[model samples]
Target: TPLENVIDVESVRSHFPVLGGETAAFNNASGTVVLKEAIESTSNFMYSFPFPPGVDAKSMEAITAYTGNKGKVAAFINALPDEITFGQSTTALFRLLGLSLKPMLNNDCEIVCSTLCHEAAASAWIHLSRELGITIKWWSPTTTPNSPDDPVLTTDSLKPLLSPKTRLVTCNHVSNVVGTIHPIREIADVVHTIPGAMLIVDGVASVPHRPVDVKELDVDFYCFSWYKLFGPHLGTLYASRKAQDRYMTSINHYFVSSSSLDGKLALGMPSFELQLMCSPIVSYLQDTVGWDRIVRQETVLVTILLEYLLSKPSVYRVFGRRNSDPSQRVAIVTFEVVGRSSGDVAMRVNTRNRFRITSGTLMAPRPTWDVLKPKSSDGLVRVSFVHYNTVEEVRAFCSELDEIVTR
Candidate 1:
């Protein structure tokens, strides 16, 4: 507890102006504030080096800038620079990835989709399977723990779903709704055994919470959106070399050669201004704050929020990893007040000192909402926190919520 002095929530808060307002920002699971460094760097690049990457004097400088950004993101996740691709959003990139791998699918092919993954991660394949008339299996956590309907993915549940024909298995690193961290490495180890099957992870929820190591996990694909990671409305995708060389095709023009994995998957240029802005923040994260403190700081706030919610067992039923461990889940805590309307509770808390939180099904339509049934149609309330938040803010938000949760 003495080491807590090493962490500085205010230092992190300075980088995000959205936190500068009177109200506390807890809806980070939905979106994060744009980093001040990102904004400054982007404005400078726009005026100085407006053109795209190239070999000319100004263009070379642009190329260096672009690569520097790319390299930093790559380093952040322990991936190669060429493995990274910028897209409009995670939804758009998933759609594009589905299109890129179209040639690899046939009647013999099958795709396994985890029920926990967001619609964007699995929707593309859901559509692709229908288009190609291939077998599409929905995988769930069949081997569940002796608990409530909290089903997390288990290899025991996945084996029966896999076959040689399985092109890939799609899942989330952490459920946007459940907040439970899935076992990506363990699943990848199993999925890799299949001859052609690859593991693709929708990491939109996990990237902002902890460090990512694509190399260690050895996943075929990892993706997340920048809007929710203190950047612009852009998406970052990490496609493994095996994925690029073996299966990926150009979603670009008929004439454009598949020069590189980035060129092939990216149908056109990404939002250059947006990407430039995103780069500085990613570099800032990799170079300065580091992952250790980010997790350490977040864990402190998560412990405070979760401990309070867990204590009220009669009135509140918290979802995901109820144990206050950072490794088990991110800070996107989902809970519902017993005998109280979720919308009513959330709205009351919102009105009380303008606290920011979310209610309803959010984006998880299947398994998350369908299986993990909340008490009402309004769904569950999610109180999430990023590193910028301090214990004082979380405690205040919880107090504001307590007044409404009781009434």
Candidate 2:
């Protein structure tokens, strides 16, 4: 069967034990359910490790797993294992990077950030602008009149913003709200042409949906959350060798060498168990199901939602391109309904049909929904799916949404 080589949707869903219920879980943009492998690994780690840390053979085993997981994550992003750093979340990692750069930045230094980014991507740079006298350039989205849609940052859009003083340019690989995949490689090319500027990408929204190769994207810094990648709540950052060798201040102990990539960003003793869980998640994504199947399954689910929303009269606006092209976007779908508050619509649907969907600002108020609607008080309804989500589940969601919108 072709489905054998691709995704066996039923089998995939089975791996997510939490999905076995009456409710349809479509809030993957916020966080994903853990894989069965991840759950078991976490449990095994708890039992395998006893009181005194890093002493016995179990400690060596833990060290081996932790080191191997770094390689796995690094390989997933096409980076060296030494370049990968783990943090609490993507926001925390980016904030750490921002703070590290602050002391070295001068009044002449400039940072370019896109308005299409989530607050996590832009907040640190904005703070640096205020305190360090660094110039912050806003790369505003291009608006299409009478439409809620906005353009994702393009090399053409970002070109004008690049200058010799531009030390960093940050943007999302895919917008959490817009669901459009930005041209990261192109953006990187443009940024690299500037004398000292380096590209930093927020891959939190895109990494789960597609594979990322830092070498291919040519971005100096990339960060994404593991929680979104069907693992424990953690974050991963890929800092290029070039960037690590630069003016980055060590976030760790005074004794930790600034030249050591991992030591420079090492927060503390590290979450040994959580780090162990990452091994299975990466294995599941890259080895078990593979990205080809994941993309295939996600495309089918997203297309069903897009077609239904487009056909519905009550759906006043959708935040992404209404197409099935997997290359263009991920499975995230954000929409606003006519004569209904976003929260009310989501609540009503979930209450009646027992479907879990997200509503309100979705933590990206600045660049997406707020600017798109301006007057919208309740924000937008977002239904984000993953490969584990079945086509049947999407149909069930559409059926429930149809009744809610019409009622």
Candidate 3:
């Protein structure tokens, strides 16, 4: 049988070092396998100078390189260079962002937190609302709380939540648990109508699969991890000028301006090894492996798994959107076997086969799980396939899954 819209996996697999092995990796939603471009660039930087991160030639060069890389990434997201900053991870970035905004908040202010968010976005605001005496009104995708339907954050549901005092509206571009895409652009438009409210998004699960035009989305602050997108462990933040000038306060040295992104929001320097790898990684994705092709690749692979899972509804309960469309979601899927423990099934596949997967909360939080309430205490089993994954790998993994559920 022929599969349409798929790139040649063997050719695509050459760029990733991990695909050369026997085991197939399906935990891509956790973090993607690193690229060889990161490897070659890393070694070259270390070997090129003794003081790679020092104040000398190569060290100063790294500073310039990172600045250039920020520009590249900003351009990728349709943002300005000054709008970008780097941190340890998306979680840390949100924490730093939450703290930096503390000075701008007053007691009794209102913030709208989305129920469809990962902990990276939801957790920070939960703690911040308590600490700052800010009120948190949850913006769930559905009209009712804990609806069995897929979570889709719409502007219709968001309209009633808005008020004159709402300072912020926080959500994710794609929910890590539900594996569904929210309408961020429309949500931003709705939030923009309110006087000073800003829309902050977590793109950690979204950015890797498709192109996000931040200017088009018009979000105030967008944060995601590069490690999840074929790069080293580094997080990037895009804070629009409106958000910066109005609400942000500098968390750095006394002299840095509140509106300056790299100077103010960035607490300490990021890992230079990782920082140096950013530009090369961005270029490789843009030039060699296009985002469009990645989307196509993931579609062909996920449809195979989805078709198999949907066939045996009595044996499997899927947690996310049950669509085969790539535009509505990424290639991440979560489910639980009807008669088996999720943790036990994951470990069984691990021990019997040469594939890797995960079974746990996946950092989705209490409110999200309260809706699905999967049978396993360990949480749902997730299998996330990336562009480099082959049709053969998914088919074999499905064979393993069929055995686990039926036998």
Candidate 4:
């Protein structure tokens, strides 16, 4: 609690140069600038190099550096030395998950996916079932709420969807749309009761606010992105040892059967440089604000922001929990101006407010479509603030929204 303001917000914010730069006139798009530390680390990681041909002393040194980077990534996630595997992004990692897990299922086997899942999580499993001749069972929240942390999947809602035919149940840990924090640990417990069903989690939203521990969640597989979490544009995966042994990584290797979970599932040459950079920032986060405090402090910001949005009755409608609680939410928030198109709302925020907001499907159509049969179906105004953002900026953004909608 006392640690809420422990870290210097300005110092941390300064590390993100893009936030301090001049705004450019462009279409509303979702992108983040590289952190100052990451840039500095990259420059340092590369500065100590000499160009040389393969199979030389320099090549061996480079290999050592890369492996060192991998170790750092593992430490950042609170994972074991080789429990982590890296890829291009969480979306790319899902394809790898589908590829690895499909052969284990028989023609009659079934996988369970919720309608609230991200396209990456849902589509990959759907395609796997189609190609491998397995069955797909869809799980939909009975009561749809327009937020990610809406407590959608409960034991009561999910128990009916699972059976022996269900080999796996996959869903998002935190919604990118309404910021609903799905009950992953509870879902995992329920899935385990289904004789053969394992749990798969899409952690793209949750991991940014909450550092995950797969053992505690007891999930079979978890996929999340670094780009969303203030890291590199890479995806890190957590798979159980048994799951790793059961599936073959798509990477080609005649004798490629590997050692640990990390080695077994590694799809390509590891991004040693990026992994090295990932560690410093994560270390900074954990060192400054402990994981639990990060979650707690962010809940406070979300509460204030939601209250601001809700107070603007003429224009704004806040989504997700109306109260403060970490169990029901993450850092992301979504809302829109009443009687105005989401696209229009986003454009004005980006133009006048200079606040980067997303509108089109949030690339999370299932979650958006489930809650409200959205007028345009493109998406809603998504104002996501992570643990690093300030209450003042959030308040300022709210004021901007009031002015923009009143116009």
Q: Judged by lDDT, which candidate is best?
A: 3
Q: Write the per-residue lDDT of candidate 1 for residues 287-318, one digit (tens) a residue.
A: 67877887878888888888888788888888
**Models, CA RMSD each:** 1.9, 2.5, 2.4, 3.7
Q: Clash pairs of candidate 4?
A: 147-178, 148-178, 148-179, 148-180, 149-179, 149-180, 149-181, 361-378
Of candidates 3 and 1, the better by TM-score: 1
TM-score of each prediction: 0.95, 0.94, 0.94, 0.88
lDDT of 3 by residue, 1-407 (tens): 66754686667778896688878989889888888888787787677654425877767876786677678878878889889887888988898889888888877678998877787787799888888987789886663444353656788888898889888899888876677778888898889898888889999888888888899998999998988888888899999988888888888989766566887777764566676677777787788878888888898888888899989889888766787697787898888888688999999988865899988888886534765678777778989877888888888899988887777
lDDT of 2 at 239: 88
Descending-TM-score candidate ranking: 1, 2, 3, 4
**What value does the lDDT take at residue 325 in candidate 4?**
73
Considering summed lDDT, which 10 consecutive residues are worst modelled in model 2? 1-10
Q: What is the lDDT of candidate 4?
A: 0.70
Candidate 3 global TM-score? 0.94
Query: Which candidate, 1 or 4, has the higher lDDT?
Result: 1
Instruction: Please report, as a residue range, the 10-residue window in candidate 3 with the lowest summed lDDT.
Output: 142-151
Which segments of candidate 2 are over 4 A away from where they belong? 1-6, 50-58, 144-148
Q: Report the Cα lDDT for residue 287, model 4.
A: 76
Residues 300-363 of candidate 4: C-alpha lDDT, one tens digit per residue: 7777777777676566666566665787677677766677888987877776646667687867
Every candidate's lDDT:
0.81, 0.81, 0.82, 0.70
